[PDB]
Amino acid sequence: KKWPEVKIPARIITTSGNASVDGNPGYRPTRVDSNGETMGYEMRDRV
Amino acid sequence: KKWPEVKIPARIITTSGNASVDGNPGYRPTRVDSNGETMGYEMRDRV
Amino acid sequence: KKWPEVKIPARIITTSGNASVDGNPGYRPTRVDSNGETMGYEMRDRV
Amino acid sequence: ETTALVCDNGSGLVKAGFAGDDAPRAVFPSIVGRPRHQGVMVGMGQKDSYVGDEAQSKRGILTLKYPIEHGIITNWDDMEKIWHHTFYNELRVAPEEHPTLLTEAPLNPKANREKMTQIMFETFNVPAMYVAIQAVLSLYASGRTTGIVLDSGDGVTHNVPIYEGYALPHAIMRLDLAGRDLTDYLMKILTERGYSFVTTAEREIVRDIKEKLCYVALDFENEMATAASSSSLEKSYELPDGQVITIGNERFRCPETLFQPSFIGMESAGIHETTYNSIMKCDIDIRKDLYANNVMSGGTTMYPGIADRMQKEITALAPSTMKIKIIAPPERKYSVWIGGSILASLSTFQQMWITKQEYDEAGPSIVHRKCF
Amino acid sequence: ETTALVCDNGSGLVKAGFAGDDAPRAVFPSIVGRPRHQGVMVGMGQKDSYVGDEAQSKRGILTLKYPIEHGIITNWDDMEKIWHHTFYNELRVAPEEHPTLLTEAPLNPKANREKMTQIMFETFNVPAMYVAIQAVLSLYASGRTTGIVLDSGDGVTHNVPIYEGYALPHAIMRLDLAGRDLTDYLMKILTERGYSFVTTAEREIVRDIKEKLCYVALDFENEMATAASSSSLEKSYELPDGQVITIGNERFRCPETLFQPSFIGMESAGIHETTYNSIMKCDIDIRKDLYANNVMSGGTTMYPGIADRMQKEITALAPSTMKIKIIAPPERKYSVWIGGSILASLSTFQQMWITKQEYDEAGPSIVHRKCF
Amino acid sequence: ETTALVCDNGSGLVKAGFAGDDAPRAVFPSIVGRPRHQGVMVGMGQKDSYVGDEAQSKRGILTLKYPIEHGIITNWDDMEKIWHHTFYNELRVAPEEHPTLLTEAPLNPKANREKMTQIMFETFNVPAMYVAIQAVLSLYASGRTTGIVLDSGDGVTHNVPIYEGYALPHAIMRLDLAGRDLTDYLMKILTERGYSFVTTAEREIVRDIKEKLCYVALDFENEMATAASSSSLEKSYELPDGQVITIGNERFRCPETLFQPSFIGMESAGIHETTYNSIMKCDIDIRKDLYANNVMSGGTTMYPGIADRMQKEITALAPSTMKIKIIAPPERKYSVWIGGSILASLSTFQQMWITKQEYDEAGPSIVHRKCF
């Protein structure tokens, strides 16, 4: 038995808190955005 | 010979009598009604 | 005409009630000790 | 059946011990406490509830609650737990072979006594038991044939006149203002200086502050006038966290609510003028001996200055030619228990126990025929 | 003395304005801010501090701090600055010729009133001033003269039973759980979804989220169940950086702490049942009219569905025969101030002012004699 | 179930090992690295990614990145890679038959737990698993059940007040100022002296410099003053290239930002004054035992002089009459893991495990019911 995948909500980059973009130079920050609204950011890929 | 249990009459909370709600903050006041004749109160449980 | 200052007594920081340290992050609490005990506390200045 | 047990189920302090002894074996608060916040440490083995000194010591993590209010048992599960504790842990005695004497305030609901007796005879299997009024025990404690007792522990203040061993039930007066109610007023008035207290453990701290710093004025207006030059009457107190409270007027404002219930908003007369009214309801010839034998008992008669305040008020009310004499032995707190231990050992009293064989034939209704 | 001023210097908003007006002239926040970073730009003329709307708008660069904590003035320099602002900038009035009425929470420390009066008479030089309890003013605002009037502003909640103009001071109840603490609890639960907010400006953002999206559940477990099924209960919000939040359960978990203070860790009962306890402390005949006149006021009584929820709770606690009617005029937020604007306008009130010559003849201690 | 595994998913250092052992079997950085430059040799033994010590040693060619940021998993592919590494290469253990205990920071996003549980049950297929908060494990490693526990790893600092087995969730405090963020400040301030580490490989060199040279003060101002005698403070360091660095003020400037977050622009208070605030949020009676049992844990409490500095600050804040005793065992770095290796061994704890069936009957939501 497997359950459906549970997904992380897109992060809000506050001035101090759960994430900051400079902490991990090896990921690019990428935006997630649909229905005219951008739920926040994810960390990904190269360069 | 186990005789039947007697029941404490529900307390009638007057203005300055032998009963007041605030004396035991560890109990909540509970209404013990009987077909619209509310009788009085008894105290138990959290909050 | 003028009258002498009515100095505010140092606040006693009860676990809940009219005083708490964290409610104002713009002030630091300081010791206001007299005769070997802190009495209460006062809040001022940076951090 | 070797030795009787005596229990004063105080609204604030359970006082228990064997009969014949001059002091209770064990004294502990009548407090049952439940853990407030969630436990996280597996295998520490925390109990689901605490009672007496266990609750008092760990009060910071518990929601303390009093089963007694104004002398009336309001929660019988916690009261049964307190009974079980005071028998099996403090006195370390199985109650199924010891007769037991219990002290109750007057003018209490009859169902309270009936269910108390039911608890005694069905879940503790006490061989024989009796209920005596708290104030009448104070006359055995003082060793007197005659007197107007004033008793006030934590739950009530009440006064009973007794003359040559005959009570005067129609003259009994009762007020529900007492220790716990008077602690709450101290919590209120401490906010005038900024010292807020809300939780029940902090109410216990306020109780400690009251017991250690409060006193009763001789003239309340002169203490108020001298407190204006607020240097002499102020006293400090150290909280368990290390802060220091300093209180001025509050240390005599709080006990004065006994002498003026208008402060807590009650219409009734003070601790004085109710003793005097009980004396007024007595027979004309009785009053001479009552003025000279006004006997104080119970915890809230412990303040410094109490006897002077009350004597000054009673002399002001009573006729000038009568020599008022208030009696206040230093053992006010345990006097009710001392009287209970005294009379329980009397050879004549052994006929007045409610026996198990009497209860199983007449039930919890037996108490109204055997006891006062 | 042409026109009185009225000020509700609560923990959130400084509602100030003249008498006779039906609405306050300025509702700027009671906030003072200092620059957090170094001002590299020479000749910009940047000030050393900002207050009110200036600090609120430029919050991204300032360390916002509230001079009021739970209804008590904690920093008198910043509070004097706020007084100076509300007089000279917002109202554009020189206070040295306008009598001023100030509204304070009950059971406050007396030194707060003393120093407030000293400030008003000795640095602003008002010709007269008076202090009134915030909840009592919401009766004049509702026009009626009986009710268990209840206030939940930003800093405290309290409820003050009044009947036919007479206050019942012994029945006053107070909780230090309001708009600030609710905002902090909303910040705490927003981390469950990853939306971390730690700075003081982010508190103002979470206060906006609180005011725009939160509502009170009619049945908490049912709303929890319907939120646990993925459904239209969940709402989005847009930050001043354009990043988009979504909140589900949190938008009714936050206001529910008013009814279950256990969520914020307090032992005290909720806004319901404390309002019931103050009704129980009242006289027996008074409760008929208190149940029918439960007047609400202050900012944190604005949550949608609060009236129905509390009405259900009070009808559950109270006897079934009772008709219960919560009064909530749509102007809840300004009702304390509207009450002061009525009171200051009355011909019968004009003798109750604390005159300048009454102050300098007796010091700041005049307040406890002239005022409630 | 043979023997439980215990894992601390350190933001900087993963710790793994079996229960009952007093030290973790394997410790390696939580680093996943990709080849930055193109490969030209054919059949070199190529891998598309390196993890742990392989990435750390080959760092000159790899773009090292941390899946953990401030205690939260920011990339799940690299985290699954790290999980697979610590199971199959370091421990050399098939996780299909070993229950696993994981240590997480408090106030984390619930989705972090739910996806972690889904991973451990659906790709590594552990028979049972549990989540525990690192501070409670440190308190178990102290052999204690009462006291403030302050854990500051590479990702976050957090303090959790515990008393006699009960946690105080409302008093928990959390800061993202920790080891990784502290290395970045050293990277910034090293440019004051000309050194210009910019790459993620040089990040590790700066971390090594911090670990081997940095220390804390008794008075930051005095240490700044001793920079006038600019010979005694300075220490040398040799890079892998052979270049020799010398640093003065920077070696204690970097740790000092823990006590003054303003250095890196954060508004919140330091590592001190947040422990003190968490203590003051606790119940009044609770605080006496908290000051005497201030346990530390985590890698960034390892700077020499941390105990002295924080003891001085806490004694300055707390009342003078209260004895303050910071507990700092030598094994602070592994104390979270040792706490887990105790907890997972307890016979009483065997009922707390989230079994495979308890997951597959209720999905990843099970954690919020079973775990704290």
Ligand SMILES: Nc1ncnc2c1ncn2[C@@H]1O[C@H](COP(=O)(O)OP(=O)(O)NP(=O)(O)O)[C@@H](O)[C@H]1O
């Ligand atoms: N030294 C003291 N000074 C003043 N008040 C005291 C003192 N010691 C105790 N108290 C008060 O007295 C109460 C205890 O008195 P006590 O006679 O033992 O009452 P009780 O037996 O618990 N209740 P009661 O049944 O009403 O007699 C405490 O709860 C306090 O309110």
Ligand SMILES: Nc1ncnc2c1ncn2[C@@H]1O[C@H](COP(=O)(O)OP(=O)(O)NP(=O)(O)O)[C@@H](O)[C@H]1O
């Ligand atoms: N629509 C709303 N919904 C929910 N909360 C609100 C709303 N409007 C305002 N608030 C809250 O109410 C606070 C202001 O209410 P207000 O009555 O002005 O408090 P106040 O008078 O300053 N406080 P106080 O006098 O100390 O009790 C704000 O700071 C918010 O916390």
Ligand SMILES: Nc1ncnc2c1ncn2[C@@H]1O[C@H](COP(=O)(O)OP(=O)(O)NP(=O)(O)O)[C@@H](O)[C@H]1O
């Ligand atoms: N000897 C040391 N001196 C100073 N700092 C150190 C030392 N050893 C480790 N550190 C710092 O602490 C970090 C690792 O500490 P550790 O206790 O392993 O935290 P973690 O478990 O990796 N993080 P978290 O999951 O948030 O607890 C390193 O990356 C450094 O930043």
Ligand SMILES: [Mg+2]
């Ligand atoms: Mg008693």
Ligand SMILES: [Mg+2]
């Ligand atoms: Mg207000």
Ligand SMILES: [Mg+2]
């Ligand atoms: Mg860690």
